[PDB]
């Protein structure tokens, strides 16, 4: 993967949490052209899709569809140490899809399932780690309730969530299965 | 019975006068012209829709047929109207003034009309009253047939009327009779146009799917002919032409056993694999369509105000050509002596494509560059 | 009586540019599976990415037919809840909350 920029477009990001689908974030309502995806995790038990427009690097929605109760780890409290970096929606260098013009979905989905995923959930916040790697760099802040973190090796590694009240982690745990 | 005819000729040779006289005289001698609206307002190759053609229209009625007559005010309008399929025609009416012979513009127009495949042309000599000799009329009537035969029209068999529209609409007999003979030639010499349902079957592929336990299904709208269940069909396109059988036809509301042209249907095939079928291909009757890569065609480049280039292109031009359902990048060959092709003028060109595509003579296409329609064309002659 | 739409009960309007609803109760061989909007999101993505074709209705019907013939084959091998499926050219995940006596489908991918 490759992430290369941030923007500053002020627009409301809606975040719903169903009892079926664990998490879902919709920063923009994309209808000009559907997005293309990067799917991470273990393909059978832990799948997390990330959508990004084809016209540019803007994201549409990143949501995990299924997560294992064993691949998560609840802890007492956060390590909330947060150096605030530039705010706004990030972008992605779309070279991964060299031929997105063949109009076949096969060449449209690049998904490295060799990287697993862990989720650190608490009654206060929830963070997501990918790749089983000890890499940390700047933390982009999409909204005050939703932050994101890139690694040193040109990739997004850590995800974070704020202002979450356990009334919806009830549905989150009803959906994790 | 509804038949579409067109007028070809110089503007000041009196073609509008002819149209007015035809309408008024046939309204007098026969019943009034019906107000029926039987035809669409546009053309095949849907990406070329919205070129803002002028398309001057009239309508009249004979005891046997109802004629919709179309003419274009200028050269650019006429060439856009012929290259695109707007206001389709089953016959054309060549208008030449007997006072001054055919013009180079008329010669180019009938050449274009042959290239686009206008099936029949009858000639009307106007202003034959302003000449006091029958022999000069004989010589000009011979030279127009000679020109028509030069451009592959049956010049020997072409009906020719020596009349005068002005004196005809001035109520004088012996000229009303001449334009009535013109209408009779419209009735007799022009055959009934070939119905689309009777043409060979052809279906552009738009989307392809696979259903477990059922097979591969293609979803497109059928352009010509009829397809029934159990018949063998040949898929022709980028890959080598393959054979399959239609094991059913599915429609959005009910499953039917026959697919008529104009309907959006779903065709289940036999034995074919999803990987072998693509979008740019077409289903057809076996042996009725062939794939080609090189073809001579006549094209019109959009002007700056019509949404085309602001600058000309040259011999090294390599655009995409949008056929029924896909674009294919192609390289062009210009006529000798043509260094540049400005925006807004029509020209002949020999296009060779990077992948084969099922094509026959008369197939229209769009010319795009980056997803924006920049020109329109029609294949004139398929090559190797 | 239709061919495929007789097994679908629509619950939301159609996805922009298609004829498939955002969510529906699919009745396959008597089993009632409610489709989460994510499956329909991905199906509409498939049908729109090829470009607007203006004949999207029959394509949507064929897509729903393929989805039904895949979910019946998923029932053929038994439903693995919250796990990716092995049906050829597809992949589906299911779930079942206590309030829902009918299973729910959360994922549809057509490679």
Author numbering:
A (entry chain C): 3 to 179
B (entry chain A): 10 to 393
C (entry chain B): 175 to 285
What text does the study give?
The CdiA–CT of enterohemorrhagic Escherichia coli EC869 (CdiA–CTEC869) cleaves the 3′-acceptor regions of specific tRNAs in a reaction that requires the translation factors Tu/Ts and GTP. CdiI is an immunity protein that protects cells from self-intoxication by forming a tight CdiA–CT:CdiI complex. Tu:GTP:Ts serves as a reaction scaffold that increases the affinity of CdiA–CTEC869 for substrate tRNAs and induces a structural change of tRNAs for efficient cleavage by CdiA–CTEC869.
To determine the molecular basis of the interaction between CdiA–CT and Tu, we crystallized CdiA–CT:CdiIEC869 in complex with Tu and determined the structure, as the CdiA–CT:CdiIEC869 complex interacts more tightly with Tu than CdiA–CT in vitro. In the structure of CdiA–CT:CdiIEC869 in complex with Tu, the CdiA–CT toxin interacts with domain II of Tu on one side and with CdiI on the other side. The CdiA–CT toxin domain consists of an N-terminal three-stranded anti-parallel β-sheet (β1- β3) and a C-terminal three-stranded anti-parallel β-sheet (β4 - β6). Mutations His216 and His281 in CdiA–CT reduced the toxic activity of CdiA–CT in vivo, indicating that they are residues involved in catalysis and suggesting that CdiI inhibits the activity of CdiA–CT through masking the catalytic site of CdiA–CT, thereby preventing the 3′-portion of tRNA from binding to the catalytic pocket of CdiA–CT. In this structure, Tu adopts the GDP-bound open form structure, although no GDP was bound to Tu. α3 of CdiA–CT is sandwiched between the β-barrel of the domain II of Tu and the β-sheet of CdiA–CT.
